[PDB]
Design a protein around this motif. Structure first.
Motif, PDB file in Angstrom:
ATOM      1  N   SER E 142       0.852  -1.185   0.000  1.00  0.00           N
ATOM      2  CA  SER E 142       0.000   0.000   0.000  1.00  0.00           C
ATOM      3  C   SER E 142       0.889   1.236   0.000  1.00  0.00           C
ATOM      4  O   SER E 142       1.259   1.747   1.058  1.00  0.00           O
ATOM      5  N   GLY E 143       1.233   1.713  -1.191  1.00  0.00           N
ATOM      6  CA  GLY E 143       2.060   2.884  -1.326  1.00  0.00           C
ATOM      7  C   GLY E 143       2.476   3.146  -2.754  1.00  0.00           C
ATOM      8  O   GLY E 143       2.178   2.369  -3.666  1.00  0.00           O
ATOM      9  N   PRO E 144       3.172   4.254  -2.977  1.00  0.00           N
ATOM     10  CA  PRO E 144       3.592   4.605  -4.335  1.00  0.00           C
ATOM     11  C   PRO E 144       4.893   3.937  -4.732  1.00  0.00           C
ATOM     12  O   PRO E 144       5.824   4.612  -5.184  1.00  0.00           O
ATOM     13  N   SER E 145       4.980   2.623  -4.569  1.00  0.00           N
ATOM     14  CA  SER E 145       6.237   1.938  -4.815  1.00  0.00           C
ATOM     15  C   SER E 145       6.124   1.001  -6.007  1.00  0.00           C
ATOM     16  O   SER E 145       6.975   1.025  -6.902  1.00  0.00           O
ATOM     17  N   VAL E 146       5.084   0.171  -6.033  1.00  0.00           N
ATOM     18  CA  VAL E 146       4.863  -0.694  -7.186  1.00  0.00           C
ATOM     19  C   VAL E 146       4.512   0.136  -8.412  1.00  0.00           C
ATOM     20  O   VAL E 146       4.893  -0.204  -9.539  1.00  0.00           O
ATOM     21  N   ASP E 147       3.773   1.231  -8.217  1.00  0.00           N
ATOM     22  CA  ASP E 147       3.453   2.114  -9.332  1.00  0.00           C
ATOM     23  C   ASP E 147       4.708   2.724  -9.930  1.00  0.00           C
ATOM     24  O   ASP E 147       4.845   2.811 -11.156  1.00  0.00           O
ATOM     25  N   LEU E 148       5.636   3.151  -9.083  1.00  0.00           N
ATOM     26  CA  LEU E 148       6.842   3.809  -9.555  1.00  0.00           C
ATOM     27  C   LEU E 148       7.846   2.832 -10.150  1.00  0.00           C
ATOM     28  O   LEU E 148       8.807   3.272 -10.789  1.00  0.00           O
ATOM     29  N   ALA E 149       7.651   1.529  -9.954  1.00  0.00           N
ATOM     30  CA  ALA E 149       8.422   0.521 -10.668  1.00  0.00           C
ATOM     31  C   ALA E 149       7.749   0.100 -11.962  1.00  0.00           C
ATOM     32  O   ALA E 149       8.437  -0.251 -12.927  1.00  0.00           O
ATOM     33  N   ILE E 150       6.417   0.125 -12.002  1.00  0.00           N
ATOM     34  CA  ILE E 150       5.689  -0.040 -13.255  1.00  0.00           C
ATOM     35  C   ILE E 150       5.967   1.078 -14.245  1.00  0.00           C
ATOM     36  O   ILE E 150       6.030   0.820 -15.453  1.00  0.00           O
TER      37      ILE E 150
END
Ligand code: HEA
Ligand code: HEA
Ligand code: CUA
Ligand SMILES: [Cu+2]
Ligand SMILES: [Zn+2]
Lengths: 268, 56, 374, 117, 535, 124, 58, 48, 100, 236
Positions: E142-150
């Motif tokens: 739950s955070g902007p981490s997987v998005d920023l790797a996508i």
């Protein structure tokens, strides 16, 4: 190579582009878009005036590339027979890439349609999800796209027989005839009774018919830039690579729509 | 005679393919008759002795 | 095991109809440079249909006495012999004999194999799924076969495409060695409605049957096409089939099967007409796509129509629809190539395609009768 | 930007390749609107002159030092790729003849000289 | 302003290859240190460096896979050797779309920022390299981490696609006066075949990853089984990209090896046309087999049987290339320069790595090897010992022709031996650990698996020393590189033949089959003014 | 005589203008019928053309392989010393003791485990 | 003059001495706003990506 | 100015600060970034 | 596809038309690059070509390539018992008699 | 069965399926060793004969019989390997009469076992949960990161059919010695079968990644005799 003063002109038919600042600027705009989108969805920004600025900068960057790609073909005069063929090959290799994002979406629709899960009662478009009648506005759109396909062929056969009033009219009707498609498909999302999150059906329906929307706004922009570049006398009767590029994009979009109408609206 | 030499590399190729396969079959026939079969035999003799105890 | 039997029969049908189409990119060209006729090549591609249609009556009598497995292994032996003959054959007689033997081999691996699957699975519900899965690679064979033959003919010699199939057949035969009264067809070809249903498929597939022998020669002459390209022109149709039978299989249940067949006939007729007006291989992509799509619609609409007509107007057995479709397909493949030389030597290639297209279009209106059958 | 050419005899540079203008109310032609290395091609193909040659090198005769094969170059060097006298016999060896020394092709032996144009 | 118009606002293809090289070194140093961190925590049982955090071990593994599949091998093998060499080999001045080359460079640095910010904005993105759907959701991450790797797999995808289009459109209509598409060198064919796969495979990954993003952030229920979706769909949409990907990393290597074997064994390649068809077949059969990664998901028994057969057919085309390289080395003279040692260490170690693939393509045997360190040892022999070795060989082969500066042979040999020993000591025991049953992606293991983990952590410290010595070799190349051409006869591209006198050799020194080694010591910024001629 | 005699020990130290005069004096001395050439001239002509100087020197001399060997050893003795330092300072859990791995053996013996090749958890 | 300035801008873009994206006396209105807003966009995505690594939200 | 030190983005000779400093800092930063992230995420979660 | 008696005619013809030293060494380098050892007649032409071009080292190195091309030592001594009148007439000395 | 300290090869088998896997692996390794030895020998020959050689055979570049021999020989090996693979793929399974069913639901960081038989009229179905014993609470001799508080107990010589599902994310049921590795996705039911030939204790570990404590999810299966199974089942 034995012409008299041949060293004074280039010895090969290829374009040596001058140094330009646009590749760096587009990259920096995409960086800001990525980071701002990845943050604004999770707090950390609050104000949505940064994401809009990032999108505006990206679009302006593409527009400013295309200016320099038009000053090099109409004014400076560097598109020989070879460079034009390279540009055509390149454009086809992008249309092909854009067709293979739709194959993934179609395989995401046949991987759920055939094999429906236990949770949803086994039935397509399931109970409580009233589909859209395909003998209504989604036929008017198909008739409009078929007509637009035929109105642009009257624009390319009037620039070869040298009729100016008859190449401007065809492009005008075509541009007014893809705005009606967008209007009809924006009146069919505000008159619908199922949203993105109510099923796996409304999430794939709005992801193959929502990408087509983005691809049809680009046709309006391309056709406007082709009407305005003909109004100002930029196209000759044998050297017009913007009309040909815009016509092979319209036809691919029509063929793709004929597969979103018999697989999404009718099949089920 | 001794001053007519015609083909020498072809014989070398034939001898070097007929010795890289004898070695391979020798080093692969030790994996199947000295590393595998005795293991299966030991496994089976274990089970034909765990059943005789149960029968008794 | 039941699954292994299904695997055996599936691979048998796939290899049988794969060897029926790797011939197409090759023999029309191989028998075209040895000379340096139309009816000759047309009959080389038509011995299989006649032999299979004449052997279907007697393979059943053979399978009554000895049983299932031995006739199945006979299809093995005959098809291996046929592939070896095709491997090394430059005289027209040898290739004709190979195609003649292929018919017996194919008929022995279908009547016996389908009966074996029926015998193993006695559920009346699992039978439908098993028979459907086994008959699916029947169409994949002519999707994986044409390109392979052309590519290996250009890149390698004739025997290279024809020995891989022999090796695969031998694997299938080794696995086979390791594993081991309804209303008659005559009467069911008497009532008119099933006659219309079968004629639909026959006239639908006669177009592809005629395209098979004739198209490479016209392509080579008017096109200057390379050896490999002969395969590629047939890729769009086969792929098209795999599309058309997935979409218009369920859609015909709600659009009306009769309407689906009638529209498919018109589409295939227009596609056939458009073929003669092609100057480049890219011009063949569209008409081939249309013909494949229309044939897919016609099959997916008519065949369940035959099932319903048979089980309503008469009493039915499981292989009744399969027997009807076999007679239809074999009759079409016999007639098409056989008339190809006669209707293409006196008059040009465009004329034969135009005649078949007009025939399909004019047969289209008869599909109204199947709507609301008695 | 200066006097306009009418054939490839009057083209001394890119100052001779601007051209007249079209008239208001017509689709302009390529002889009325084209400037750079595009109009040079037009002006060459309307006479028969191919401004951009695509002829592979001579593979009819070998080359000795007394009588060497003459490669034409607008520079002091040119890259030449030799494949033999029957023209595909020898494999490919690349060579750089210059105005001071001649290439010699370590397998077949063809000698190459520059005609500096 | 002359600096900015040449190294920020660029059009020249050889000025972007150098920037790719300098970026690849950075992103291959980061990943190597992230591998050392894993290999120092997996030394003896317990919680040694990362004190108790089982996150920050998965984050390190994910950032080690992404940083060094997408940021080291692709940029080096497609940009530094594709951009710099293909135009010279086919005889073209620059590429057909120069500004697209510049954008292909410049989308990468802003892709590294997102990935590095995916490791500091919260606990991180420990989803593994393959970002599977139900773990990469909003309930575990739950955070902007997987998005920023996508968004780091989108910018790289755009860069690769735009480069592929340039490569295909430059090799078709920008050739010399007599060069048909049957006389091209093998490296050009390698780039063309990898560029077709990039067009045909990237869009599927884009669709899958974008759908995952939409599920995370807009509540779409693509892969949630409570709305009618299946996570297995993602796997399909990933692995259609997954297997073509692993060939994109290896086809450019193959071509390089060919050139090396053709030079230091003074013989042309055995069956060049055969090698072209072999690469084509490897590329084509890399699209039809993608479900051997997922045999334990519950496939039918008639789909396992197909994918077992369709994977073993790839062995046939690769055997042709291996045997052709042996045949081309057979009859000729061999001189053991530093590129040729790497060429030899690729013909044996790649075979060892790929033979374990035929043991894993079986559906029956994948029940014993899936999610096990046998797979890790498999792909390390084909990635770390097959592709990185090709990159090193290409560097030591073409560095003098690019820079004009030579390198010490003794230090390069020391580095080669240290890499050889360390890589062979680090990955080989992983086979034993896999056979005994050690699963993947585990920070701590039972006591029984300790011993080999102590031998596999000793090789990492031997390969990091090789990297440091590589840095010093670059330093001696740049400083006092001009005076390093007389130390050894490694500098010579080809020795004299037997009867060729030294005096005749010094006049006619370069005998080649490509335009690469006839150019100046640093190639001129505009190399071809008057076109090259071929027979 | 002195100019050509013993060119194996002097050839490379000469400049490139005293090297093109020896070659230009052996090329007007070879036009004569051989059997009129002194032995020193014969040996010098062989050395100048087919000899172990210049383009014909080895890649690896005897004093370079020793350097490479003793460079690899000094690179494996650094990694060992770095790995021992990270080895004394370990977190050894309670389970990694012999008096604990002999207790697990009694359990695995009672519940017969590894009837084939072996059970033994003792590794101290 | 007439709508065919094409033969008058073809003599201007040739013989210019400036980069083609900043030669016309209109490129100011395109290039000043664009470069001005790009530096604010890039300076706002670097203030919120360092303010996020520290845990600060809005 | 075509030559052996012309196609490199950085200057290597005739330089105020010797090149060893810029060469070493590059590799030091590259091999030290992966440890800074670990320190940050270890100190953000209670661990030392 | 080429026979011994066509090899030994084509290379004699090539050797009787070399005009420089580069060409003599080129034809000698592509003669010792097949599976067929050159016949005693071909090497008799090579030495005359080396005498026309006025080179001594190439005439000594031809005999030193034979001992690497041949399989045994008896064959080498069978080449030297027949190419003995050519050597003692031209003046060529083998390497093992010079000891360079 | 338990892992051993310096292992090189498979664990010991207790089911026919694992024996088939071992036999097929050892069959493939035969041909793989043959090919590796061939390639290594030719590289040795190249280094030993042709290193700094005076004669360069620059005209052997085509080949025609040798090129058909490395395109057909590797194919024959592939067919020989593919025969036993297909026989094993289609043969070995639960052909007749499964005799017991255990539902193994994989939660986040523990396991949940239900025995679908043994049902009373009111729904008294036997069920329990398996956790990992932490290092601090281990007794004398228990295995670290493999020993659980409640262990699955099954009879010897009885078909056991496992139905695997998940509640949170994708897990993997794996017991190496028994040859069972099935996946556990959140919206489908997967199934495996096992027949155990000898009594003992069999340890296993999760395979697919599930988050923080993916290292702590052991599986422990005991194969007791029928009498001990009856006595066990009558206390739970
Ligand atoms: C980049 C290197 C690379 C390459 C080139 C390949 C190509 C091949 N890979 Fe791929 N593979 C990976 C790296 C690579 N792979 C990675 C990283 C994964 C997934 C990791 C993950 O996602 O976690 C993967 C996926 C993957 C899997 C899935 C593993 C699993 O999760 O269960 C398997 C086996 O199932 C496999 C095997 C093969 C094979 C057989 C080849 C073949 O192309 C190799 C063929 C080589 C030979 C055959 C040598 C030929 C030599 C001869 C002398 C011929 C002799 C002929 C015969 C033996 C018949 N690969
Ligand atoms: C690109 C392929 C690649 C590379 C290079 C490496 C490098 C290394 N890898 Fe592998 N590894 C993978 C493939 C690769 N790995 C993948 C795909 C994963 C992710 C799996 C997952 O998601 O779970 C992984 C993860 C992974 C792990 C964690 C797996 C886990 O627990 O789940 C481990 C050890 O445990 C390991 C081992 C090693 C080691 C010790 C090295 C080191 O030895 C590094 C080796 C040294 C080098 C290769 C030097 C590099 C050279 C330079 C930097 C200069 C570059 C040269 C030029 C530019 C000319 N790797
Ligand atoms: Cu549960 Cu992993
Ligand atoms: Cu794979
Ligand atoms: Zn030549």
């Amino acid at each position: 190579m034995r012409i008299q003063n041949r060293e004074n002109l280039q010895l090969f038919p290829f374009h040596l582009v001058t140094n330009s600042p646009w590749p760096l600027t587009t990259s920096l705009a995409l960086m800001s878009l990525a980071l701002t989108l990845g943050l604004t969805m999770h707090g950390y920004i609050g104000n949505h005036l940064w994401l809009f600025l990032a999108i505006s900068l990206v679009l302006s960057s593409i527009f400013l590339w295309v200016r320099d790609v038009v000053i090099e073909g109409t004014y400076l005069g560097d598109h020989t027979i070879a460079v034009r063929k390279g540009l055509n090959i390149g454009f086809m290799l992008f249309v092909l890439s854009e067709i293979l994002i739709f194959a993934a979406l179609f395989w995401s629709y046949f991987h759920s349609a055939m094999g429906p899960t236990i949770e949803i009662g086994c039935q397509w478009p399931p109970v409580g999800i009233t589909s859209i009648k395909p003998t209504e506005l989604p036929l008017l759109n198909t008739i409009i796209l078929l007509a637009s396909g035929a109105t642009v062929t009257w624009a390319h056969h009037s620039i070869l027989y040298k009729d100016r009033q008859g190449t401007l009219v065809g492009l005008f009707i075509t541009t007014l005839l893809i705005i009606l498609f967008v209007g009809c498909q924006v009146l069919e999302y505000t008159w619908a009774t199922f949203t993105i999150a109510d099923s796996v059906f409304g999430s794939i329906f709005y992801a193959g018919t929502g990408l087509h929307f983005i691809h049809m706004v680009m046709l309006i922009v391309m056709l406007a830039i082709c009407y305005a570049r003909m109004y100002f006398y930029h196209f000759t009767s044998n050297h017009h690579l913007g009309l040909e590029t815009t016509i092979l994009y319209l036809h691919v979009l029509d063929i793709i729509w004929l597969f979103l109408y018999i697989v999404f609206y009718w099949w089920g | 005679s001794l001053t007519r030499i015609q083909g020498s590399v072809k014989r070398r190729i034939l001898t070097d393919i007929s010795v890289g396969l004898t070695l391979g079959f020798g080093f692969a026939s030790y994996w199947w008759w000295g590393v595998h079969k005795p293991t299966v035999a030991h496994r089976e003799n274990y089970y034909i002795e765990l059943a005789k105890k149960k029968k008794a | 095991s039941r699954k292994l039997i299904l695997f055996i029969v599936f691979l048998a049908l796939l290899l049988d109809n794969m060897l029926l189409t790797v011939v197409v990119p090759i023999i029309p060209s191989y028998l075209y440079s040895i000379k340096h006729e139309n009816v000759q090549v047309g009959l080389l591609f038509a011995s299989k249909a006649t032999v299979q249609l004449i052997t279907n009556p007697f393979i059943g009598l053979l399978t009554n006495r000895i049983g299932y497995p031995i006739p199945i292994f006979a299809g093995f032996c005959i098809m291996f012999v046929s592939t070896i003959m095709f491997a090394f054959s430059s005289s027209y007689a040898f290739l004709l004999i190979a195609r003649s033997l292929q018919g017996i081999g194919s008929s022995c691996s279908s009547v016996a194999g389908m009966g074996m699957l029926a015998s193993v699975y006695t559920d009346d519900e699992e039978r439908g799924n098993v028979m459907g899965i086994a008959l699916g690679g029947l169409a994949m064979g002519v999707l994986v076969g044409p390109p392979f033959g052309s590519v290996l003919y250009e890149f390698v010699g004739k025997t290279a495409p024809f020995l891989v199939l022999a090796a695969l057949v031998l694997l299938d035969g080794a696995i086979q060695l390791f594993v081991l009264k309804g209303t008659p067809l005559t009467t069911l070809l008497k009532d008119p409605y099933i006659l219309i249903a079968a004629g639909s498929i026959c006239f639908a597939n006669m177009g592809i049957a005629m395209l098979e022998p004739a198209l490479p020669i016209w392509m080579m002459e008017t096109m200057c096409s390379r050896k490999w390209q002969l395969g590629v022109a047939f890729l769009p149709a086969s792929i098209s089939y795999l599309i058309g039978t997935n979409i218009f299989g369920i859609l015909a249940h709600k659009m009306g099967r009769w309407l689906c067949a009638l529209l498919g006939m018109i589409i295939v007729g227009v596609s056939i007409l458009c073929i003669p007006f092609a100057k480049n291989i890219y011009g063949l992509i569209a008409p081939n796509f249309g013909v494949g799509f229309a044939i897919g619609m016609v099959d997916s609409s008519m065949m369940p129509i035959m099932g319903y007509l048979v089980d309503l107007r008469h009493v039915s057995v499981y292989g009744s629809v399969y027997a009807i479709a076999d007679v239809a397909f074999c009759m079409g493949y016999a007639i098409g190539p056989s008339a190809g030389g006669a209707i293409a030597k006196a008059i040009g290639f465009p004329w034969l395609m135009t005649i078949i297209g007009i025939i399909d279009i004019l047969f289209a209106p008869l599909c109204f009768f199947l709507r609301s059958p008695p | 930007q200066f006097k306009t050419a009418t054939s490839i005899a009057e083209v001394e540079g890119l100052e001779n390749l601007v051209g007249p203008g079209a008239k208001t109310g017509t689709v302009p032609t390529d002889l009325e609107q084209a400037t750079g290395l595009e109009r040079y091609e037009l002006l060459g193909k309307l006479e028969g002159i191919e401004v951009f040659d695509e002829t592979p090198l001579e593979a009819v005769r070998k080359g000795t030092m007394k009588d060497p094969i003459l490669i034409d170059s607008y520079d002091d060097y040119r890259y030449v790729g030799c494949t033999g006298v029957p023209a595909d016999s020898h494999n490919i060896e690349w060579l750089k003849p210059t105005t001071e020394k001649n290439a010699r092709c370590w397998e077949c032996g063809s000698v190459y000289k520059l005609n500096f144009l | 302003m002359n600096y900015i118009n040449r190294w920020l606002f660029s059009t020249n293809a050889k000025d972007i290859a150098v920037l790719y090289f300098i970026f690849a070194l950075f992103c291959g140093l980061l990943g190597s240190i992230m591998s050392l961190i894993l290999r120092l925590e997996l030394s003896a049982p317990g919680n040694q460096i990362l004190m108790g955090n089982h996150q920050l071990f998965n984050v390190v593994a994910t950032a080690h896979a992404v940083l060094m599949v997408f940021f080291l091998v692709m940029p080096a093998a497609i940009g530094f050797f594709g951009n710099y060499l293909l135009p010279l080999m086919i005889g073209a001045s620059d590429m057909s779309f120069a500004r697209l080359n510049n954008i292909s460079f410049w989308l990468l640095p802003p892709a590294l920022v997102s990935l590095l910010a995916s490791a500091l904005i919260e606990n991180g993105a420990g989803t593994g390299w393959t970002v599977y759907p139900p773990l990469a959701g909003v309930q575990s991450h739950s955070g902007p981490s997987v998005d920023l790797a996508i968004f780091a797999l989108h910018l790289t995808s755009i860069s690769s696609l735009l480069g592929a289009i340039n490569f295909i459109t430059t090799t078709l209509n920008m050739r010399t006066i007599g060069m048909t598409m049957s006389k091209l060198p093998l490296f050009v064919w390698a780039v063309v075949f990898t560029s077709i796969l990039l067009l045909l495979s990237l869009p599927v990954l884009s669709a899958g990853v974008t759908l995952l993003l939409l599920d995370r952030n807009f509540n779409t229920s693509f892969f949630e089984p409570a709305g009618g979706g299946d996570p297995i769909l993602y796997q399909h949409l990933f692995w259609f990209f997954g297997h073509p990907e692993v060939y994109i990393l290896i086809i450019p290597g193959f071509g390089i090896i060919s050139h090396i074997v053709s030079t230091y064994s003074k013989k042309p390649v055995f069956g060049a046309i055969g090698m072209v068809y072999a690469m084509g077949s490897i590329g084509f059969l890399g699209l039809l087999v993608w479900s051997h990664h997922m045999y334990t998901v519950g496939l039918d028994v008639d789909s396992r049987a197909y994918f077992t057969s369709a994977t073993m057919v790839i062995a046939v085309p690769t055997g042709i290339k291996i045997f052709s390289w042996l045949a081309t080395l057979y009859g000729g003279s061999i001189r053991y320069t530093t590129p040729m040692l790497y060429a030899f260490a690729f013909l044996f170690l790649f075979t060892v790595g790929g033979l374990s693939g035929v043991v894993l393509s079986n559906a029956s045997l994948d029940i014993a090897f899936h999610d096990t360190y046998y797979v890790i040892g498999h792909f390390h022999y084909v990635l770390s010992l097959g592709a990185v070795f090709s990159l090193f060989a290409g560097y030591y082969y073409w560095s003098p022709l690019i820079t004009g500066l030579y390198y010490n042979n003794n230090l390069a040999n020391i580095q080669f031996w240290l890499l050889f020993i360390g890589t062979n000591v680090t990955f080989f025991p992983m086979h034993f650990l896999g056979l005994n049953g050690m699963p993947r992606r585990i920070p701590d293991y039972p006591d029984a698996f300790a011993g080999w983990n102590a031998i596999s952590s000793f090789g990492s410290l031997i390969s990091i020393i090789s990297v440091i010595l590589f840095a010093y070799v670059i330093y001696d190349q740049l400083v006092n590189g001009l005076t390093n051409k007389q130390l050894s006869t490694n500098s010579l591209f080809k020795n004299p033949d037997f009867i060729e006198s030294n005096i005749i050799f010094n006049d006619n020194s370069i005998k080649s089959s490509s335009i690469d080694f006839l150019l100046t010591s640093p190639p001129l910024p505009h190399t071809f003014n008057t076109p090259a001629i071929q027979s | 005589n002195a100019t050509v005699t013993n060119l194996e020990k002097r050839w490379e130290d000469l400049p490139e203008t005293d090297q093109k005069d020896i070659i230009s004096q052996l090329s007007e001395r070879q036009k004569l019928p051989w059997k009129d050439l002194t032995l020193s001239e014969k040996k010098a002509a062989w050395y100048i053309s087919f000899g172990e100087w210049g383009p014909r020197r080895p890649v690896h001399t005897k004093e370079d392989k020793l350097y490479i060997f003793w460079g690899t050893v000094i690179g494996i003795v650094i990694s060992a010393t770095i790995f021992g330092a990270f080895r004394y300072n370990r977190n050894v859990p309670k389970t990694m003791n012999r008096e604990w791995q002999a207790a697990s053996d009694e359990y695995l013996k009672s519940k017969n485990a590894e009837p084939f090749t072996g059970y033994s958890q003792i590794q101290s | 003059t007439a709508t065919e300035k094409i033969i008058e801008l073809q003599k201007f873009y040739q013989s210019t001495n400036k980069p083609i994206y900043a030669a016309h006396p209109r490129s100011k209105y395109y290039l000043i706003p664009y470069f001005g807003l790009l530096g604010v966009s890039v300076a706002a995505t670097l203030f919120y990506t360092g303010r996020a690594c520290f845990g600060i939200k809005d | 100015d075509v030559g052996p030190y012309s196609n490199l983005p950085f200057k290597v000779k005739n330089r105020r600060v010797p090149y060893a400093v810029p060469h070493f800092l590059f590799f030091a930063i590259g091999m030290g970034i992966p440890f800074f992230a670990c320190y940050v995420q270890l100190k953000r979660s209670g661990s030392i | 596809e080429e026979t011994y008696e066509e090899f030994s005619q084509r290379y004699e013809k090539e050797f009787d038309e070399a005009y420089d030293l580069f060409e003599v060494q080129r034809v000698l380098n592509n003669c010792f690059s097949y599976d067929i050892v050159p016949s005693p007649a071909v090497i008799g032409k090579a030495l005359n070509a080396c005498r026309r071009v006025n080179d001594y080292a190439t005439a000594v190195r031809v005999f030193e390539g034979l001992k690497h091309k041949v399989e045994t030592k008896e064959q080498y001594d069978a080449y030297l018992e027949e190419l003995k009148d050519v050597r003692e007439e031209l003046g060529i000395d083998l390497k093992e008699e010079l000891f360079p | 069965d338990v892992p051993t300290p310096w292992g090189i090869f498979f664990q010991d088998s207790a089911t026919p399926n694992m024996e088939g896997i071992i036999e097929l692996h050892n069959n493939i390794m035969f041909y793989l060793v043959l090919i590796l030895t061939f390639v290594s020998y030719i590289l040795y020959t190249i280094i030993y004969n042709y290193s700094n050689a005076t004669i360069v055979h620059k005209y052997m570049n085509h080949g025609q019989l040798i090129e058909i021999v490395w395109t057909t020989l590797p194919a024959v090996i592939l067919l020989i390997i593919a025969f036993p693979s297909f026989i094993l793929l289609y043969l070995c399974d639960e052909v007749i009469s499964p005799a017991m069913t255990i539902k193994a639901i994989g939660l986040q960081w523990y396991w949940k076992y239900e025995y679908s038989d043994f049902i009373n009229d009111d729904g008294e179905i036997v069920e329990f949960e398996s956790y990992v014993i932490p290092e601090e609470l281990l007794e004398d001799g228990q295995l670290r990161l493999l020993d659980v508080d409640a262990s699955v107990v099954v009879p010897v010589d009885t078909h056991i059919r496992f139905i695997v599902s998940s509640a949170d994310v994708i897990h993997d049921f794996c017991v190496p010695a028994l040859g069972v590795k099935v996946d556990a996705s959140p919206g489908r039911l997967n199934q495996t079968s096992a027949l155990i030939q000898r009594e003992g204790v069999y340890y296993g570990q999760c395979s697919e990644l599930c988050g923080v404590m993916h290292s702590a999810m052991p599986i422990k299966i005991e194969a007791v005799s029928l009498y001990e199974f009856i006595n066990w089942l009558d206390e739970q």
